[PDB]
Amino acid sequence: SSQAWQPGVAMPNLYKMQRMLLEKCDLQNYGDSATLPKGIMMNVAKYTQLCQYLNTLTLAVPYNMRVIHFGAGSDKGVAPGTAVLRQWLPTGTLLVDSDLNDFVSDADSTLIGDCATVHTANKWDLIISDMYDPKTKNVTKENDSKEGFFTYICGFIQQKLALGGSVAIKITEHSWNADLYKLMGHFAWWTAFVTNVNASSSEAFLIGCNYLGKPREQIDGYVMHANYIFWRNTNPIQLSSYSLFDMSKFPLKLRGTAVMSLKEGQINDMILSLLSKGRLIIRENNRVVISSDVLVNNENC
Amino acid sequence: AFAVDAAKAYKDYLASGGQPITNCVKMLCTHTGTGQAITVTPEANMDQESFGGASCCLYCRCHIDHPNPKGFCDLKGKYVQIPTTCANDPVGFTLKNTVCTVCGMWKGYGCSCDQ
Ligand SMILES: CSC[C@H]1O[C@@H](n2cnc3c(N)ncnc32)[C@H](O)[C@@H]1O
Ligand SMILES: [Zn+2]
Numbered sequence: 361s362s363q364a365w366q367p368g369v370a371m372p373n374l375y376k377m378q379r380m381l382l383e384k385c386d387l388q389n390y391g392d393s394a395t396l397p398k399g400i401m402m403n404v405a406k407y408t409q410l411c412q413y414l415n416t417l418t419l420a421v422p423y424n425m426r427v428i429h430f431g432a433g434s435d436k437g438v439a440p441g442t443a444v445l446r447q448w449l450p451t452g453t454l455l456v457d458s459d460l461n462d463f464v465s466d467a468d469s470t471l472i473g474d475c476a477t478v479h480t481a482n483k484w485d486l487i488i489s490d491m492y493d494p495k496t497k498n499v500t501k502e503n504d505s506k507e508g509f510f511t512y513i514c515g516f517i518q519q520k521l522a523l524g525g526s527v528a529i530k531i532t533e534h535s536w537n538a539d540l541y542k543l544m545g546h547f548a549w550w551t552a553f554v555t556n557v558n559a560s561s562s563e564a565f566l567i568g569c570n571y572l573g574k575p576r577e578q579i580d581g582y583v584m585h586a587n588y589i590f591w592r593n594t595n596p597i598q599l600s601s602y603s604l605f606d607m608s609k610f611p612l613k614l615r616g617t618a619v620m621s622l623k624e625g626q627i628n629d630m631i632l633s634l635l636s637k638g639r640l641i642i643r644e645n646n647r648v649v650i651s652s653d654v655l656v657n658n659e660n661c
Numbered sequence: 662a663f664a665v666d667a668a669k670a671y672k673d674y675l676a677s678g679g680q681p682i683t684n685c686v687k688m689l690c691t692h693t694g695t696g697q698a699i700t701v702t703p704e705a706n707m708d709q710e711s712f713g714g715a716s717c718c719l720y721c722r723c724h725i726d727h728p729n730p731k732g733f734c735d736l737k738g739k740y741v742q743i744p745t746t747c748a749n750d751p752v753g754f755t756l757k758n759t760v761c762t763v764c765g766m767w768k769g770y771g772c773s774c775d776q
């Protein structure tokens with residue numbers, strides 16, 4: 361439909377309310393490819409549409425914003441997604457990215473290593489993950505909730521995402537986690553967003569909008585992933601790169617959202633209401649300090 | 662008194678007909694920007710492409726030290742504008758050309774301070 365002129369398609373609310381069984385994902389336009397603007401990489405186009413969609417939500421955008429980006433490398437040794445995030449985010453936003461393999465980045469700081477080795481002293485206003493292991497695309501194995509880096513991401517959100525902050529975590533048919541879905545119930549709102557340039561893939565970004573630090577709804581993660589696949593299975597999405605040609609409104613508006621440090625007891629319903637509206641961030645405003653754990657080994661006989 | 666001269670290496674490599682460094686990260690943008698050379702956000706005009714700075718820096722891409730004495734990089738974390746007629750080789754372009762310290766345009770590719 362009119363969907364082709366959007367940056368992508370978000371999961372309709374009706375599918376979220378179903379109780380489907382997990383089936384295999386069979387996409388009708390499987391193998392199709394979007395025609396990309398001359399010389400533009402798939403990941404630039406994919407991150408641009410993700411960012412164009414995030415512009416429509418109620419993200420908190422404070423001064424001194426802090427954004428962490430996992431899975432930022434590429435097989436090309438560069439970081440296309442980081443470059444789009446830095447273009448999108450207000451100038452001066454602290455941008456940290458990370459990947460298992462080495463790459464050169466425009467981020468303010470890059471950590472190379474498994475994401476479970478990454479620790480941060482400070483909390484974050486936005487977490488982006490494009491972590492993905494292609495060995496999960498095994499159609500001969502049962503499709504179970506995966507752990508690995510998804511287990512890291514769940515703990516990382518609960519321990520280091522500021523109240524009011526948001527996340528976008530890439531998933532696929534086979535690359536998913538039941539607890540992450542359940543954690544979407546801890547945001548004021550959530551969806552699974554599919555970019556129009558990659559609509560032939562079962563990829564989506566699991567988006568949690570304005571983190572509340574507690575269950576707002578109770579979500580069964582296995583059922584919810586089955587709902588998502590059921591949506592993908594019955595709603596062919598027309599590949600489109602139309603939105604990439606309209607960059608006039610792309611940059612994220614620096615809203616100067618308020619940041620307050622608050623203790624657990626002080627979070628009343630008035631606070632929660634502001635958190636839900638993207639009008640408040642709760643965290644310390646201290647220094648951004650990060651590290652990566654390094655395992656030491658002496659291989660000498 | 663020995664350090665490697667990667668800049669010379671790449672120039673000689675190009676001159677011999679070497680395929681320019683690929684996978685420079687080109688950005689989507691309006692192409693209605695100021696056209697200055699190195700900016701905090703994409704600034705291509707109608708005759709330029711905008712690229713992720715790091716991906717266009719020879720030193721970054723080769724995993725070698727920067728010639729800056731404190732090791733600082735001019736391009737990483739910014740966006741470089743490249744004339745579309747040179748966008749096949751953004752690394753070569755940024756190496757071989759120079760930014761006017763007065764107006765911020767590429768000398769010979771936007772700088773009009775000699776009029
Ligand atoms: C953009 S393609 C997906 C990226 O995610 C990265 N990735 C996958 N698993 C992990 C992990 N456990 N920790 C860090 N990066 C990862 C891969 O190295 C690849 O660059
Ligand atoms: Zn550099």
Ligand SMILES: [Zn+2]
Pocket residue numbers: 761762763764765766772773774
């Ligand atoms: Zn000049």
